[PDB]
Design a protein around this ligand. Sequence first.
Ligand SMILES: *[C@@H]1O[C@H](CO)[C@@H](O[C@@H]2O[C@H](CO)[C@@H](O[C@@H]3O[C@H](CO)[C@@H](O)[C@H](O)[C@@H]3O)[C@H](O)[C@H]2NC(C)=O)[C@H](O)[C@H]1NC(C)=O
Ligand SMILES: *[C@@H]1O[C@H](CO)[C@@H](O)[C@H](O)[C@H]1NC(C)=O
Ligand SMILES: *[C@@H]1O[C@H](CO)[C@@H](O)[C@H](O)[C@H]1NC(C)=O
Lengths: 132, 231, 231, 118
Amino acid sequence: ERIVLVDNKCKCARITSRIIRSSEDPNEDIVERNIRIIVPLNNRENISDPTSPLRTRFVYHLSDLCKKCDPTEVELDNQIVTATQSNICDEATETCYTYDRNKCYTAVVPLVYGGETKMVETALTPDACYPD
Amino acid sequence: CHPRLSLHRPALEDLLLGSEANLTCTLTGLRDASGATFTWTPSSGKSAVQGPPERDLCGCYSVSSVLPGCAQPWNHGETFTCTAAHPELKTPLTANITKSGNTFRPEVHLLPPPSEELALNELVTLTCLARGFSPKDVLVRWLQGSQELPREKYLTWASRQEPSQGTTTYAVTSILRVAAEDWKKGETFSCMVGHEALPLAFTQKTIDRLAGKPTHINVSVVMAEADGTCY
Amino acid sequence: CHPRLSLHRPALEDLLLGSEANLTCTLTGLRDASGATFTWTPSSGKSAVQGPPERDLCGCYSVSSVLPGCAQPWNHGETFTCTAAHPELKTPLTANITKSGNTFRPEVHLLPPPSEELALNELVTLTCLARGFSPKDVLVRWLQGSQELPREKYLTWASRQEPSQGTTTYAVTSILRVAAEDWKKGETFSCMVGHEALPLAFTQKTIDRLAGKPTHINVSVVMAEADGTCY
Amino acid sequence: LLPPPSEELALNELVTLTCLARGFSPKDVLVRWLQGSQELPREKYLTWASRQEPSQGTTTYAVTSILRVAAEDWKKGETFSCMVGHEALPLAFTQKTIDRLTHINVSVVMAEADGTCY
Ligand SMILES: *[C@@H]1O[C@H](CO)[C@@H](O[C@@H]2O[C@H](CO)[C@@H](O[C@@H]3O[C@H](CO)[C@@H](O)[C@H](O)[C@@H]3O)[C@H](O)[C@H]2NC(C)=O)[C@H](O)[C@H]1NC(C)=O
Ligand SMILES: *[C@@H]1O[C@H](CO)[C@@H](O)[C@H](O)[C@H]1NC(C)=O
Ligand SMILES: *[C@@H]1O[C@H](CO)[C@@H](O)[C@H](O)[C@H]1NC(C)=O
């Protein structure tokens, strides 16, 4: 519980690690790793309303959580070059299990107004969707 | 002896880090090395230099030429057609060179030190393996933190071809020895590999002691009837 | 061309496994034809038989001679001087080769595959490493269970020297790719290294699954009515 | 008396059980094997002779014996034994510790604690 490696908010998974310089045998020590999963019991499969029933199966691949594909900057000789950081990021397309506090999620519903119909837009998470 | 003609590709260290992709054309097997001919097909900055006719196997003179240029017409797929129409033969001969197609891109892997080097507390070894690339050219550098180490601190082998799973691909390795104390203090190291088939021309892997195979694992699964927002 | 004579130490594959200790005093580059004779300083009980000359660069030849002394007084401390004789530049050449001193032992490491390769269900790769040995002569073989794999299934590099503090030492690597079902079933593999400064002349290492497996795993299922996480 | 190696219990053909007797002063000692509580004919196992064990100060002796038995019988749970007989013992008695049989721990905690996280 000391250094954060992964803090993922599409799946709501968090991985930390710490070198525990243990008491007995004081010239060797362990490496501990903590994983925390929070499982929502009322979310759907796709995040729209009538999709499919509530999700009952949750799968986590640690090779995908630890992935790193955004380009970085490296000073080699007296230069700045751009490099990648992973072997597998041939492509959003991932499925999310929870929401995220900092993003809107909307929908579209047709309702009637006497004559024709409209394409009324509906906020699914009302705190994060004010225009500001 | 017997005359021959050759054309070699530009070196990868000046094509990727810089862009000055000079070419070279070489004829060997002459003893009157003043009367010679070189002609490329494009020559706009046509000052193709020639050098001193250095020796060869058992003291035969050898002439060569360099046509300067940079890396936009090479990587776009042009062609160069050096030819020797010297008067030491009564018939000329020709060769050409083009950027190689049918490429593959490598897979880079960094490996942590073995377990039985950590007992001695003297020095530990880090191995870098790059596999499966179709041309025979590659670059390997090392970094500590964000500082590049000088080239006299690690050993890099050569690039060889591996047992055939259908098509011909290559491999290369490299090792580096660092102090055993500052690996445990928490420094980070990186192996950087450059090859002309990668999209951003470079790729990097970074390893340290905390991002390794753990001894203890703690898993806690919490079930949240409340909300699905993940604060 | 210029005439020169050198002689070579016997091969390590014939000196550790087989029984074919052969020293080869040979001169290549001969202005005359095949008219040469060689005498050696020991007279152990065998005639240094010869072979016919060969084809070389532009008129030069290559004669040779093998001393058949495959009884090994080589590792006891002999000195084994050769001596040339030919209708050539009339000063008979001599050369001297002996077993080396100041020997060190190699240190052998066998590394597990990277986890990224493991999570893809294809071939997985293993790495052998030996470093710190004093003469640049070594043999690397592989095994699966007890069967030796044929040497067309794996790639091994040359033996180069490493940057260090005074005492010159050398290193070598090798790889081998196996199928994921053989790894996941529980079949073991081995890397085996032969050197002259090892007292029993060979070393083994072995690897499979459950090598860096963890020792403790805690699972906690926190039910509802207790959700108390923090930011 | 020692458990079998794991790799001989992967081909499931035959297993080996090794009885080691160590550190006794006179150099004369019997070894007899028995299946369950019935003995075996002595043409079904191999036993060595005794040798001077290397030791600091005072001298001892050691002896060894083995038995190859069917793998499925050991997978079932039949019991094997070893009877080491001697003159400097109370009654020359046996030792029978081998059969076919990780540490798991299951806990329930209320944990209405003071204040914590997860
Ligand atoms: C999960 O659900 C969302 C929400 O329903 C899906 O996205 C939506 O998919 C529909 C059908 O593909 C899109 O409708 C299209 O609208 C355009 C006009 O903009 C029209 O040209 C098409 O004929 C069609 O009517 C819609 O745009 C799209 N996006 C939204 C609502 O933002 C999504 O595909 C679902 N994903 C999975 C994996 O099930
Ligand atoms: C390049 O050389 C090859 C043979 O060396 C031959 O096809 C021709 O001379 C050149 N190719 C083209 C397309 O001009
Ligand atoms: C051994 O080799 C050295 C180096 O050339 C030489 O000086 C010496 O005379 C040789 N000794 C014998 C016995 O050949």
